[PDB]
């Protein structure tokens, strides 16, 4: 039932969706979690509610100062680095079209989503491979074209994300650092806005087809996702995109 | 601890290698197994020794009547079919020319890989369509062009599995059946052949670059991988093939 | 205009449909056509048509001597082989579910599809090694899940040409042959069928959606990425699968 | 020969390399080129040595107002804008490790590479929704782990790219464009560096294995690919990736 006693995750956006899934479940367990945000409020409340285990570290992943503070602090506290799980992501304006994507957002999008996600993985790698030991995840998408039901900045950051994946797997499997990526189908509530309209809009079409129960059920069948390949039952599993989507993608 | 507790799984080719770490691995997490094989001895023993849960039924895979018979009589014994992991696999002369393959070998590998997936997974569905309920598994390969270690024949075979997984997903997902691969690289110990020969050759390359703790762990990498996606952790997984290689096919 | 000249080019399934737009598109191009097929009325008149840089050879692709003959006499003919195109595709009922393929459709489309496109594929390497030279295509489909729109036997098959011609592709660049395929969504007007009810069901379905002029257009548009690849232009243009659909299968 | 005759095309990166060749062959086949680049002496000579149907425009790709004035001088010149290939590509410290990227080096090659292909793409498509006619290009990579042989930056950047080009073949073919990429294997003579320095080590790497007669075979093999793909003879083929590359990604 402790499927990841005594490791240590870092988890990015983990205050809420399915980053906070994923730090209880990790939590429960037995990882020690560091909780990664900008929503300290939440974030904080997490990690008072879960104890000693589990803390909180304000970062804003496309800041590589934050990412080096939130690596090394974790690393001081515990003495290692088992699992780093760039899962932190934003979204500018749904279901819009290229011609009315501004480079603002664009820029906005993939400053958190792919820039963040790259400096969470140097950072990580960088403690990772003098342990030879280690498992670097992403929060990724489905390979098909799922800008209609997000956005063109988002799906190009995710399909970034999941070439990342792939080159670091490459990269560090020598080092005996395992790379891989955990996707829902595309947009899953708790997901940030580059403004709160966007998160507003991103609400609406959530609860327009779906029950909060439903939404809860994708958001942990990811982090049961993330759980098997942080944990040492997928010591061989590396470059995969692991999508969990019901097969929605494939037709 | 108890992953699958209830749940009835068949494994084809449950008698050695993958199948056989997976028969084990089912039987520990609760499952009831039915082990499917024509190596009788090898497979009876693995029943007697695993006890009641467990048992050994003869069955060609190419061969339509051996496979229905396969599943009614594991319906018969436990009123339902959860999980059905058609792992069977055999390979011609390994690392031959496309030139030098005869029109024979290519038949026998298709008949029992890829057609013997076919039917396990035709008559599979025809039980879970009524559940509303199922976890139809095979074992394939990466995705790059694995016949340089295997043989053309073979990879064809896997190739054409992950494209019959692609369409089942979407067929079946309708009916609450999730379809997956899960694949090593390519050959792995356990593997049978179309003549003793090439079982041999087999061996040999095994061997000559890797422990037999190796072939072991990339064989249990494998059946974990299969436990965690016939596990109620993986209620919305369905369409991958997931390929557990450490990495090697990325680069 | 005469992008071909000179080359000596097989295609089988030449007699219609995709099969007959390349004959007639490579003739124009400046090659030596040898249409094979089993419509021998067709096939020859197309032949009897285009005059004497054409002619017709019955082969039923599934049959190995079949082959040897057209790969042989074509040698004898013209002293090289520079393009084999694998494009005959027959197919078993449309829109069948998996519970109702049998095992005798499976079997008959995987022969003609998959072993048919094997064999042809051996024999043309045979030629081309000593070669150095050569340019060996497939008709194949989309990697989405075409089998909702044909069958699963059909899908099946075409995936394992997909693989087929990746793992040719890595075996055959050292001997400069390249390896693609040219692929339409999935079913276009010209295939045959394990029975003449499933042509039937075959013609229904594409009038009930389509144009003559756009049935035409589809095979031509698959017609001219044959012309493309098999052309000096697509020298260094090897293991592709070159989908022509429109971008239907990105969505 | 004339397979562009009376199109109008926008090729960037078009001073050097692939976009050089590309613009030279689509002027060799009768299109109006619009040759946009940084490197104004190069591209004003090519300019002038090709005569009138060609001109020279100073464009940064990653400046919006640049792809604006681009965009909007093309259509007042001529009417219309057929084709808009986004080529232009830099890159950073080639061969270094994930551990030490700079930010700032990867937001210049994601700024040049990634945005600047988005800001063509939407401003091309803002001129070709009303058409409801159009072809866009992107020059990326193979789909395998390509860091190894230039940068994490790099590779992330021609990733994110052909999620751009699969979504926008998605948006973009109900108004009757289409949308594909081009792709060398990874670096290709001609590229930019992020430094003088990062071009150095791409030219020896480059000379290191390689002919100058086959580096320019390499960069007209991509050309002959845009040449197809721009052409009525691929009027229906969108969303692909066309990987020039001699099969070596497959292995």
Known sequence: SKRLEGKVAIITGGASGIGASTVQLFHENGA?????????????????????????????????????????????????????????????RPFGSILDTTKSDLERVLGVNLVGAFLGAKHAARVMVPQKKGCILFT??????????????????????????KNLAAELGQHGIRVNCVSPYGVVTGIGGVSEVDVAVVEAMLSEVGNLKGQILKAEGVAKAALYLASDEANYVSGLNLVVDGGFSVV
Do not use: F, P, R
């Open 140 to 165: 990724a998408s489905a390979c098909t074209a799922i800008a209609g039901l997000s956005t063109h900045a988002y799906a190009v950051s995710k399909y970034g994300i999941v070439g990342l994946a």
């Open 32 to 92: 020690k979690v560091v909780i990664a945000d900008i929503q300290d409020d939440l974030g904080q409340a997490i990690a008072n509610k879960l104890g000693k285990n589990v803390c909180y570290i304000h970062c804003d992943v496309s800041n590589e100062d934050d990412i080096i503070n939130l690596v090394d602090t974790t690393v001081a506290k515990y003495g290692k680095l088992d699992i780093m799980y760039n899962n932190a992501g934003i979204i500018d």
